[PDB]
Structure formats: structure tokens, C-alpha cells
Assembly symmetry: D2
Homo-oligomer: 509 residues x 4
């Protein structure tokens, strides 16, 4: 009955998955907690079983991870980079079967699932060179015979808590950067993506073991909210990188702050696209479609608000409706499929209430709005007109493919409206006006961490830092100097002279 | 009876201070809150009075500041830097008399009063060049016809809460850096240094108004915990830089995180000096003395733990005694005075309490330990030997000049003892050994934000970033790229090409 | 008969100038070369005299600067920045009178002459903060127990050769940066701006002396080609920064190369403005006018080629013409004057000769062309239409206010036409097309060092690096990491571990 | 009779090598020039043949690389990095055979041949991440409505001329970096390592072909001096990276400077190790030997001068004689050999002349000095004592394993003696003294590009920039921000507003 027992999914064994899999890795495999069965969201069938971490399994893994950091922190960064280079190779070798699992257990289409593995591969290749670059400047001291040096050192144990929607890429950014920076990692993923977590962990575990490194450098404790809470409350977890809901993340932030820990928070988005009157509509319509319906509207960067200038509102909405009607729906791993299921049945329920709540706040469904009558967690991609930009349902983040559309007239109000929500992840304007683009990029422009021009809200690459402002939680991942979040800075002054001159010219005798 | 009314203290008027001073500034001066009188700790006499912020004053000040920000954010950063350059010059012209006020109301000696003002002068000169510099890389996008740029923009309103012990320098770092970064500022100082806040604000306000700029760019609301708590809970304060105790820092951190604000935390220190058997003892002894007794032991970077290798312990303690006994004690504004009073009478009592608790836990007062028999808040700089490095009184930061001295034997144990406490601000070892030095700077070395070699734990320069790890709160100020904390990063992709994404089967 | 002896020019004494001035400074003032007279190009009247450097003067000055470097290089860079801050202040207090000297001896209008002093002031402000920042990274070694750090150290003696047209700003970018970088400087300016060189040097000398530093840190040796050639051949000149013609800089570049020195060459320009059909013409015409006739067209960044899309070629030419006929000509120090004289009498012959050659090559003079019938080296600002874009006269750099106007149709060809010249200094396009702008900035866009959009080719700011490509020599001055050209990089690996090398079979 | 025709060398065919090979690659393979046979320095047996480039081949190849550049420079940098990554993989896969060919044709030991290829693999992995990072800052303009951006674009065609000794690593450093930076490459290697060039080029071509990229992106034209001179004078070669002798490099710099090109010069070294009295002799003796005898003393980083403090000179020399006696000499593929032959018989004759000259100049040969009695270019590693530190032969860079030993007493003189030679590549001190070490790294320390502590003069890592000062030519390769030499900077100002404010506030 389990998909992994059927001959058509024999490919799952290419990842080393079996019937029932150990969900805890710390150099050894195990798991004394509850056994969980994950399901294919396209057809509600069970895939395989994962043994979750008990509290004793969590405890022993933290201790072994900390034992392993002592070895790992002594490995020169570029040699740590070499390990990350081999992780990238191992991922590359299995990119098609691993992306296939992502489509199967999580539900995004195959191009996006292989693309998610490619991000992990790409951030590995990026971290290899960065492992020869991380550090600070040597600075000119004002004091004779003194050296002034900025040093960076690992923070220790990096806990990484991931959500269902990027069960691979988010861990990848975190793991590749944390590791070249000399940290050990502990991973607790979403329970509905446990097999993905195990399959990735197996890939990394073999690379550590092939290099005779302690496996707990990249530990795994599959589990639910109690393992996540324990990590937030645990003083041995020096940095906690949490990706998830704003609601749960706020509590994670408070528990880490209570113990003077470090948190890296990637929380909810309520991302706006703005199309001005001079916008290229050949760019607006398909950009908005991909950004809205891509991954069935379940990215943190999904376009959820569409502001259109008064003069072109109707035309964009009509053209958007024409294009929605051609979205090809089916199993996420079949060719030509563009749109698959939601990840859980609860997500369908949240979708339905969102749509009803938008009707009750005076919105009009111009496209979609219904559960699709088919096996799996499938809902129609939905467009809502007529809500005021300050409608409660438009300010709520709903992880479902609902696009609230608004009119506007001038730039100043619509910039404000982009900025008025609690979230602050991604944002995008479509315009040709040079002055407006640099204003959008300026202090009176977009307040988000991602600020795009003539591309949708899901336009990001690993070269820059990834994260948001306000209720998105402030953290950054991937590129630029985001590695500094995974290390502690020391300002170091070395008197190599025989004298003791004091800063700011203070004479003390 | 008020010091400001006696002719020998007429110089306070050079700072614009009067008998009763307004404690709120937001373009205009006011203060409808509680009136307090601050006192000179060298003689327990009242100096002058400050009318503090009421709630309505606070409300009006935040509103005015956020309005001023709309103007200030539109000023090009280099021109903002020119304003900060004039603030530099305006502190330069007042450095002697402002430093005397710091000596009079806070109580540190004159060279440290002027040196603290010199730090604000220094960070101003630094920020002027930085104002032509702040920003991010243009990065190579992986997409044809796309630009990738990292932009930095101001967070808006920077609230600044400071403590009594560095009533000028801390605000100075935060103010100069926040200003060039395009933010407006709201300052709440320690009530016992309210005259210092007012005088500093007067200097800034004049520069602002001389440049026909709204003075709320650098607002002041004098007040106690109610004002500080209001700032920590106020969503209009985008960044709260808080320097203070660890207990209150933790509550401010939680309040800011509750509202998804930004906090910058600079909390307590329990800093250690370690002296290895190979150390130049002529660097060790005066470094320890200055780091210990400087500012009467009231810096967050004060050395409170002295680890000496077993082989040189007694000689170093004996040499430190001989040096403690030669310290010149007096009024802190008198030149050539080296040792002033504690900031309050409570601190004198808390000093005696810790000496007693030290003795109870088995320590020996080898020097000092007693209040001095003179007017003011004077206690003897104290050296305790014989405690275990884990004794509880030595793990509780007490703003009093008590230096706890421990023995050690080997590198590894004393590195761990340095790291064992809750705080993580400054640290220093004294050694000639090349490998030990780099290990101290490495991942198995010191865990503090300031990691020093052959100098005391105190007296950092402004070119590097300042702050601590662990219970010190993790914030940074002053140098390096600490400015990034005062701004918001954005990663910006610009599609400048006429290319449409693949139709992916949809007829458009 | 000297202007400095007339009552109205008595303001010259505020700069310490006299009838005859020493043109050598190395801590002492001297000069045993030929005495030269400088003339005011506004009326061809002699201003005053300067004694130039003999061979002996040059030798003694180099030795003294090389001795001063021993002291200066040991001064911490942030303290070297404090000196530069004071130079900036000394220039601030003299900006009106020094700018007036620039107008009187060089001949640009007063706002540009003051604005040129401003640039030196600005780069000082910048350099102060830069003196806290310069350095390189500490990198992770792949070797256990090893440090990898990039050190920067001064090159030693920076020869600075400048031209007549920016007799203050160019020296200042070089000076403020070389100084904070730990170098000593030797200046040889243009002979016809000797008083400016002497006056700048007096301002800097006072600061140095006031700070009890050897004056040779900023040495001056006024002289002609013999001194400049000596510097290019002198192994004691570790870096030679040369701003001048392409023909001379090429020989300077080879002489420095022949002795394995470092050189920084800022040579000619042939800068183009390209206005596309969608350009804001209210931006195009005033931008073109300023860039072409500002400084009487004697800037290295002056616009000399103006490409206009054939749809708007005549309209732009007509509006530009009516705009030319409204320029206020007169004495450059008189108010509201926007167009002063050429710098030399010889420059007027080159202008007349270029105009005829332009007519010779088929171009039509649609405005100007003639010498103005008045005292001084006054020529009419000129506009020439009808040349092929590749006319020989339009590819030669001529320091005259002649604008060569061309038509174009396609973006590809006109980008190529911008790039086809030998020089690669400045360039500007005027358009609203987002894609064309980023293509202009990209690998198939401008090949110049300054690449502008909707602003003239002249008037950069200090935050960025300044300089050109191709026959402009490749040097960079002022901003970004231009400072690195004044320092030598070292890549330093420190073994601090007691680990011994792999014996590899040998018994040690 | 050719080694590639013998069964024991059949591994050569795994590199695509045949009896007669084409020495030109530009997308197609060819070679109309002279046919050269390269020989094995271990036994003077012919390996294979290569058809060198005619001038027509060079001419055709430049045109193809320039056309290929139009395509390559349009490809985003991170995608260019993806090519380089595959090149590292294709090298990684062939490391043993390519290492073995390096040992066979050049003559170094197999572990060093393999290690030289690892450097290329390493710089590939480094450049891949660099491909997402290159660029400049976005700076805050002093002007409202204005953007300030620093851009970097490729230079175009980067000609790479290498010498025999690092026939793979140097090319790789220049190639990986120039490629991610959007340039195309044309390689002329040393004729005596033509097979190495063809083999490396075959490996790269396959990667380019599989990625459907024009092969001329990595062009090769095997040839002698006439081809190198062509590149030095060729305006279409935008950057010429030249590794080789100072004599030729000086001429290369002059030719490139004459045409206003860009040159990157990596010339000779006369590197010193200094062992102070406090040095760990357990570190000094092996570090000296491997730095002096490694690669038969044919590195540019080879230790040629050993300064020893008087107190320890005799001991170190005696321990270094007893260590030289254990160097295992044999064929460079023989397992467990440390020391192979010199590259040419002319290197043998230079060696002999240097020894005899050192003897005729007063030195004593305490070890070696003679040619070995076996087939190949084998000479005893040599140690010369009693020679004054400025003896003429000591300052001559002779590319052979001779180590000149000198005594010293004081830190200052021996630093001066390190710095007194014309070359400025690598330098090393062995000491435990902390103050001495930072002085060595400071402005009065080593003048070299590479400044090491307690490690030998060779063996730096790709993370840092590599190159020297003075007569070493100033170029930097590989790490840090060396990539900037392969790109042109542009300072770009964008006015996105309808206003036009001039810099420095100049009102026109
Ligand atoms: N510049 C001073 C600042 C101390 C600040 C503090 O004690 O809270 C120092 O480095 O000790």
C-alpha cells in the first residue's frame, strides 16, 4: 500500500529510502519518538514512514553535535569549503531523483523541485569560494605599535528549522553557509516533508563519513513543535535559523531573546506587485501569473496583492483571467503540468475560509475560488477584485493561491499601500519611468528586503541576501555578507610594543 | 545652595545651563514632567534641576521626530555628513567645559571627562567620510538583462537609551552613525546625568537650527523607566539602541522583539585580564591598575577578574598593592586627580555589600575595602585574593572598584574561566607567546566581543565595532560596518530588458 | 606694474604672496632656478614672480622629503588623518581668497575657482574617515595554525605633477589620499599657475609646522619640463602621479616603467555627449552648454563631441545656439560672469587654428569662431556642425571651446563612435530608456572611466574614483579604493603553530 | 624513439597527445609554424612534437578571440563561473596524467606536478564563487535625485605569457580569473613546455565545446619570442599578463606602455629567509631546505638567500649540510624522490658559472657545487658561505639551486639587506618575537609582495593576491581583489530627476 513498495516508485530507493526510515542522524541513525507516515498531496496516498526524535534523541544529538564542533571548528575554512564542495557534487548526482521526491512528498511541479535542489547545489558552489574569503579587515590603530584586527569565529551550533514549502533550498542556504563558517548544524524540518529531510541528510551523511568526519556536524532530529520549541529554549543552540509562520516565529524570537540567544527569522510575506500606467503589459500579465500561481501560491514570496493603475486595471484583470484559464493542472511530476496541489488538507480549509472571508469583506471572485473536485489537495487559482487595500483579509497572509487586486491612481499612495502591511518580504513594480524606479529603491520607496523592478516577487538569486523586514523577522540568508549572521565578531587590539598609549589620548599617571 | 548658583561653578552657564533646565527637546524646548535635581557625587550637593518628559511630551516628540525624518531622509548622505562634521566642531569648541560637566555631575576624572567628549568628536570625523561610503555592492546577476543591487536605507527613528557611566560617548557613537545613515534620533539618558544630556542636546540643537533643519532630528526626552519602557514598546521607534544593565536589557530586548522592532543591546561586562608567566609584568601592573580603578571601576569594560599564573601571582598582587597605595584621590574635576567618587550613595553601600559577601565566601581583602573618610561617594579601590574563580560574588557585576584575583596553571583552563561567565564584553591576555595569542583570537579562545592582547580590557578606539556577546546582548556600535545596524538592507533586481518569460504553454 | 603691487589686488597678501616668491619648500623656503612671472589671462598683466627650483633645489628637496618619510610613516594613520583634517580647515578659512587667486592667475570664473578649492576641502573630509579604514582583509588560511593577512603600507615619496586647468583640486585629491596613506609628497605644478602652487603650499606648511612635523612631508619644487623629467626618472620617486597632456604622459609613463616605478596617469579627454530622441531637451541643452563652455572649455572633462539623434539635431543645435548667445562674458572675478578667458596667448592661436582646420575639413561654424576684440585671451565659444564623426580635427584634443556636433540614428553605431577615439575619460548619454541606460553601463557600452546619464561629462564628486581608460592613462584619484594606488600590498602568512615541516624521509 | 611511441608512456594519449601535435587552438586546431620537439630533462629523450603558430596563425587567432569575446562578455558572470567550475572538474579528473606530463616535460617531481595542477583546480573553485561577487559599490551621491555606481566590465582579450617552471598554475590563475571577469584568453607558453600547453588547452576546449561556446575564448598560440613580442605590441591584446624574466618583462612593460595597454608583470625573485637567534631551529632547517631545493631551485619564490644570526649561523649551516646530504635525487616520476633535474642544459651552465663566480668572489662551497654524473640536467644542490651580503653573484638571480648564506647581528641591517636587492617577490623571517614580527609586516619591514613569518618563501595559497614589488613588476594574480586588474572600472552617475544640481554646489 505504501508508494515506496510499488514498482513505479522504485526510484525512491535511489535515495536509500525504505519502508520505515530513521528520522534522527547524529553520526548514527535512530529515532525513539513517534513513527510518522508522510502522504503524497496529489493523491493522498502514503509514501513511507519516518521514526521521529524522542526527547532523549534530541538531547543526545545536541551533545554529539557540540562534541563534533570541537573537531570541525579546527578545520581551516577552505578545507571546510572542500567538504561543502563534495556536498554539492553529491546533490548534483541525485538532483533528478531528489527533485522527484520533492514533487512527490511536497507537491510542487518537477521543474521547481529540481530547481530547489539546484539552489542547494548553487549555494554550495558559492560557499566554496566564500570559504577562502570570510573574515574582517585589519584596521589602522590610532596607537603606535598596536594592531587592530576584526576577527570572525563560528557561533557553534546552528539550529535550522524549516517549513514545508522549501524543504531543501532553505536548509541548503543555511547549511552551506553555516558549515564554511565553522558551525555544526541541527535540522528539524516540517513533519510533512520528513522523507525529504532524511534523503538530504543521507546524502550529506555519506560525505561526512567518506571524509571520516563526525556525522553530527550535520545532525537531523525529525519532529514537530516540541522539538522546535526545545531548540528555541536551548542554550546550546547558539543560533536558531527559523523559517515558518510569523506567528510561530514571533514565539521563537522571544524564546531565543529570553536566553540571549541569536535568531535568524524568515517569516511571512504579503507581497505586492504594482503595475503603473506605462508598464509593459506583456511583462506584467505573465509575471503576475507565475508569481501568483507558481508553487500553487505557497512561496513566502508569492504575489498576493496586485495594485494596478486605474487606466489599465480592467485590461490587466481580463488578460489575467484569460491566462488563468489556460493553467494546466495535474500531478506535479507529469510533463506540461504547471500547477499542482496544496501541501495539506488543512491548507485547503484555510484557502476556503480566506475566499469566503474575502466575500464577506465585500470582495468579488472573478476567477476560481473553489476546491477542485479531484483526488488530492487541489484548489483553483483565485483572483479577487473590489476589496479595499486595507481589508483585513488582504492584510492577512494566507498560504494559498488567492490574488487580491486593487486600483490606484498615484505613485505616493500605492507606495504607502505596499508598505502598510505588517509583513515586509518582497515587492515589485512594473514601470518604464526612470525616476520612479530609483524612488522605489530609495528611502521613500519599498520597505521590503526584496525590491524588484519589472520582475515578479519571486525574483531572487543566491548572490544577494534573502530575507525581509518588519514581521518577516529581519534575518538574511544566502549571499552578500549574510554569512556574518553565522559567526561572532571580535574587535582585537594587539599591543606588540613596550609602551601602553591609551586611546583618545588619555594620560593616566 | 545649587552649585550652578555659586560663583565658583559659573562655568556651567557656558553650556547654556540654568537653575531649572528644560528636559525635552524636539525643535522646541519643554518638559511638563517630574522635576528632578541632580547632585555632585564628589560632595553630595545639588547642581541644578531638569524638568523631565511627561507622556504627552514623549508623544509629541516622537510625532515631531517622525515628521522631521521625512525631510532628513531626503538629504543626500554626504550633506548629512556635513551636519555631523559641524557637530564635531561644536563639541571640539566645548570639549574642556563639557568634560568638566561630565566630571561634576557623573564624577569621573577630568582626563576621562574630556576623553569621553573626544570619542564623540572622533566618531563625528569618522562618520563624515563614512557618509560618502555607506551602501552595498552592485552584484552580477545570473540573468541576462538584469541588474542586481544591494541598497541600504535608514530605518527611520533611532531611539537611544544610555546609562550614567558613559553619558556622552555612547550617545555620541549612536548619534553620529545613525545621523549620517539618514535616521532621526530620540535620546533618553540616565536621570542622574540629565544636565549632561541637556548640555549635549543644546550643542546639537544649535548646529541643527543654524542649518535651518528641524531640531527633532536629534530629539531628547529626559525621563526614567517609564520613558524607556515607552520607547521599547513604541512601534514608531524602529531601532532601539539600549545601553544599560543586563536585567533591563533583557526586558527591552523582549519588548522590542514582541513588536518585531529592532534592538541594539549593550549590556553588562564581567571582564577578565589574564597574565601568563611569560608576560611583561611592567605592562601587566599599570594595565591592571588603569583597567581596574579607572572611572572608579564604573565602566562596563572595567577589569573585574584578574587571572595570574601561579608562578607570578604573589609578585603581581604585591606589585599591584604598592601601585594602589600611590593613587591620588580627590575631586574629579581637579587636574592631576586620578581617582574620583562612585556615582551614588547606593553604590557605596553596594560596594561594602560586595566586600562583605566576598569575605563571607572566603576571600581576603589584601588592599582597601573601606569607605574613604571624606565628603562624597568615595571608596577605596579594592583587591580580593583567594576566591575560587566560580565564587558567586565574582560572577555578579558590581559597578564598584573591586578586583578579584585568581590563580591558574594552564592555558586551556583559564581560557575556559574567561568564558564561563554570563557576560561577554571585553577580555585581555598578557603574554609574549605567538601561538597563544592567535589561539586566544581563534575559535577556542576568547568568546567576548573585545579581545585584547597586552593592553587592558578598557579604552577601545572608535575605528572598530564595539560590543559584546552572550548576556552583553550582541549589539555593536561605532566602527567597522556597525552602521549596517542603523539601516535596512534591500536586495534589488532590475529587469531592464524587453524579454518576456516563457509562455510555458499559455497563449498571451 | 605688478598686479600684486596695486591696491585693488591687496587681497593677495592674505595668502602670503609678495612681489617675488620662493617656489621651493622642503621645511625651508628657497629657489635658485630662473625667476618666472605669471600673467593674469584676463588682461595679460603680470601678477607676481616665483623663484623656481634649481637642480640642487630638487636634489635637496627629495632628500629632505625622504628623511621626513621616516617620521611620517611611523605616525598612526588616524593621526595622519587629523593632520589632513586641519589642512581641510585651513583651506576652509581661505576658500574665498584662494578661489580668487585661481580666478586671477588661472582665469576660470569665481564660482568654479571657489568650487575647485571646495573639492580639496571635500576630499580632506573624506580622507579623515578613510584614515581609520585603509587596510586589507584577514583571510582564512587553508593551513592549520596559520594566519593570512593582507597588509598595506605607503610607497614612500609620491611625486605629484599637475597642469594649469585644475591647479588646486588635482593636487588636493592626490595630497589628502597620499598623506593618510603614509606618503610624503613632492609637487611640481604648471609654471603658469606658480602663485597658486606657492599659495596652496603655504597653507599646508603652516599646518605641518603648527603640528611640529617636518615640512618636507608636503614639498614643493616649482619648475618646468626639466623638473618633471627628473621626477619621472628618479628612483627616489616611488609613485609619480602625472596629470597633463597625453603626449607628455606617455613619455612619463615609459620613463617610470623603464625604472620599475609606479605611475598614475590622468591624461587627455575627448568626451562625448549623446542625446537620443527621447531625451529631456530641457536637460540636454543646459547640460551641453555647461560641459562645453564651462572653464572656457579647458577642462579635461569638457564636452568636445555632441552626438544628437537626427530627429532632434537641428532643434538642439538651434536651442543651444540661442543659449550660447546669452552667456555673460567678462572678468572671471566679476559677479554673474560665466565665461572668462583662455589660459594662455598660445591657446588662442590653437583655437584659431582648429577653427580653420574644422572649416577646412567641411564643418560649418554655426556660432563663434572669432577672437573677442577685448583685452585678455578671450575667444568666442564655438559650435561646429557637419563634420563626419571621424574627422581628424574632432579626434585631436584641443583645449579650446569648440563643440563638434554630429548626427546619428542607431544606438549601436553612436556607442561605437563614442568609443572610437584614443581617449577614454568621460562620457554621457541623455535618454529615458531604462534598457539603453544599463547597456550604456555594460560591457558593450561606454569604454570611458566616467560614464554618466542625464548629466554633463564634467563635474564628478569625490565619493567615486576619478580617471579614464585608453590613452587617458588608466589612473584613478579621489574616491572608492583609489587610495590603494598610493600603497604597496603585501600578502602575509604567519605560522604560529609549533608544527614542524613534513620530514619527507630526511632525519633532521 | 619518441617517448610517446613507447608503450610505457601510453598514458600520454589520455591527454589527447600524439606524435605530432597542433600548437594552435582558436576553436579549431592548427599550426603552420615551425615544428618543435620537446625533450625530457631527466634523460634528454624526445617526447613528442608540436606545430607552432605562424604569424598568420597568431593573426587569425586574435581575430577569432575578439569575435568570441562579443559572445563571452554577454554571458552573465555566474554562468561564466559555471564554465570555470566544469574546467576545474575536467582538470580534477585528469590530475594524475596531467601531473605526470608536467613532471615529464618540465622535470619537477610527481607530487609537485600534481600539486601544480591542484592550484588550477583550486583557483577554479574559488573563481566560481567570485563570479557571483565581482563588482563595485553603490555610493551615496551628494546630489539629490542622483545615483552613484561603480561598475566593472571586462577589458577584452587577456594575453597570457608564461614561463617553463609553473607551466600550469600560472596559466590557471590568470585564466580562471580573466574568464569569470568576462575576458577571452590567448596563451603563449614556453616552447620547452609546449605539450603541457596543448594538454591543458585540450582539456579546456572540450568543456567549451560541450557547452556550445566558441573555443577561441581560451585560445592558444605556441611559439617563441616573436609571438610574445607580437602580443606585447598588439593593441587588440587589452591586458598582457607576463610571467618570466625581469629582462624580458621590462621590455614587455615598455612595449605595452608605449601603446597604452595594460600589463601584469610577474618577474624574478631573489628571496631571503632570515633566521633570528630566537628562532625554532626545528622549523628553520626543514623550511630552508625545502624552500631552497624544492623544484631543483627553479621557483620564482625559491629561497636564494639565507640570513642567520651570528650566534646560530654555524649550527644552522651544519644542520643544513647534514640535511642536504639526504636529499633523494632521481627521475621526477620515481616514487619518493625529492629532487629532479634542471629544466635545460643551459640552466646547468648558468649554475656552474654561478658556483665558480661565487668561489672567485670569496665564497666557500660548503656543499654541492658540481654537476652530477648521470643522464639529464642534474646538479647538486649547493650552499655557499663566507660571502658578503652584497656580493654581485648574490644579487644576480640565477635560476638554479644555489643558497647563499650570510651572517647578521641586528634586526635593522638584516631587514635592510632583505630590501636591498632589485627584486621584491617573497621574504621570510623565523622568530618568536612579537614586536619584531609586526615590524617586519609594517612600513619599515620587508618590501616584498609576499611577507611570511615562520614559513618559507614559497607555498602561498590562492586566497591571497600573489606577486611582488620593485623589479618583480607589481602584478598580482589569483586571490583577494586581484580580479580588478582584468577589468575596467567605471564611475557612473545617473540623474533620474528633472533637476541638474552641479557638484561642489557650483551655481552656473
Ligand atoms: N571607550 C570606552 C567605552 C566604555 C563603554 C562602557 O563602559 O559602557 C571603553 O572602551 O572603555
Amino acid at each position: 500500500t505504501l508508494l515506496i513498495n510499488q514498482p513505479q516508485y522504485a526510484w525512491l530507493k535511489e535515495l536509500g529510502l525504505r519502508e520505515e526510515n530513521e528520522g534522527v542522524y547524529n553520526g548514527s541513525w535512530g529515532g525513539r519518538g513517534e513513527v510518522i507516515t508522510t502522504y503524497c498531496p496529489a493523491n493522498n496516498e502514503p509514501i513511507a514512514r519516518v521514526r521521529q526524535a524522542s526527547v532523549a534523541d534530541y538531547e543526545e544529538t545536541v551533545k554529539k553535535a557540540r562534541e563534533a564542533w570541537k573537531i570541525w571548528a579546527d578545520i581551516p575554512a577552505p578545507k571546510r569549503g572542500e567538504i561543502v564542495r563534495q556536498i554539492g557534487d553529491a546533490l548534483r548526482e541525485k538532483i533528478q531523483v531528489l527533485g522527484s521526491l520533492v514533487s512527490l512528498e511536497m507537491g510542487k511541479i518537477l521543474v521547481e523541485g529540481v530547481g530547489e535542489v539546484q539552489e542547494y547545489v548553487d549555494i554550495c558552489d558559492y560557499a566554496v569560494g566564500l570559504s577562502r574569503m570570510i573574515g574582517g579587515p585589519i584596521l589602522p590603530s590610532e596607537r603606535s605599535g598596536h594592531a587592530l584586527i576584526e576577527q570572525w569565529n563560528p557561533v557553534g551550533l546552528v539550529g535550522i528549522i524549516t517549513a514545508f514549502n522549501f524543504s531543501v533550498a532553505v536548509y541548503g542556504w543555511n547549511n552551506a553557509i553555516a558549515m564554511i563558517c565553522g558551525n555544526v548544524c541541527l535540522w528539524k524540518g516540517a513533519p510533512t516533508t520528513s522523507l525529504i529531510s532524511v534523503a538530504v541528510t543521507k546524502i550529506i551523511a555519506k560525505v561526512l563519513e567518506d571524509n571520516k568526519l563526525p556525522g553530527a556536524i550535520c545532525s537531523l532530529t525529525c519532529g514537530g513543535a516540541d522539538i522546535g520549541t526545545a531548540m528555541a529554549k536551548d542554550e546550546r543552540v547558539n543560533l536558531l535559523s527559523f523559517t515558518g509562520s510569523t506567528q510561530v516565529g514571533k514565539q521563537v524570537g522571544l524564546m531565543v531573546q529570553e536566553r540571549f540567544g541569536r535568531s535568524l527569522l524568515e517569516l511571512g510575506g504579503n507581497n505586492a506587485i504594482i503595475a503603473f500606467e506605462d508598464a509593459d503589459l506583456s511583462l506584467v500579465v505573465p509575471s503576475a501569473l507565475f508569481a501568483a500561481v507558481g508553487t500553487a501560491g505557497q512561496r513566502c514570496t508569492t504575489a498576493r496583492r496586485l495594485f494596478i493603475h486605474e487606466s489599465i486595471h480592467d485590461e490587466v484583470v481580463n488578460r489575467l483571467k484569460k491566462a488563468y484559464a489556460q493553467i494546466r493542472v495535474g500531478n506535479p511530476w507529469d510533463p506540461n503540468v504547471l500547477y499542482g496541489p496544496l501541501h495539506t488538507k488543512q491548507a485547503v480549509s484555510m484557502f476556503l475560509g480566506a475566499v469566503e472571508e474575502a466575500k464577506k469583506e465585500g470582495g468579488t471572485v472573478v476567477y476560481g475560488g473553489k476546491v477542485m473536485d479531484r483526488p488530492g489537495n487541489y484548489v483553483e487559482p483565485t483572483i479577487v477584485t473590489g476589496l479595499g487595500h486595507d481589508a483585513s483579509i488582504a492584510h492577512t497572509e494566507t498560504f494559498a493561491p488567492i490574488l487580491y487586486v486593487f486600483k490606484f491612481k498615484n505613485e505616493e499612495e500605492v507606495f504607502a499601500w505596499n508598505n502598510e502591511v505588517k509583513q515586509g518580504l518582497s515587492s515589485s513594480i512594473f514601470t518604464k519611468d526612470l525616476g520612479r524606479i530609483f524612488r522605489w529603491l530609495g528611502p521613500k520607496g519599498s520597505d521590503c528586503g526584496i525590491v524588484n523592478v519589472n520582475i515578479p516577487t519571486s525574483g531572487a538569486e543566491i548572490g544577494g541576501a534573502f530575507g525581509g523586514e518588519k514581521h518577516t523577522g529581519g534575518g538574511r540568508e544566502s549571499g552578500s555578507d549574510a554569512w556574518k549572521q553565522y559567526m561572532r565578531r571580535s574587535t582585537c587590539t594587539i599591543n606588540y610594543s613596550k609602551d601602553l598609549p591609551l586611546a583618545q589620548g588619555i594620560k593616566f599617571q
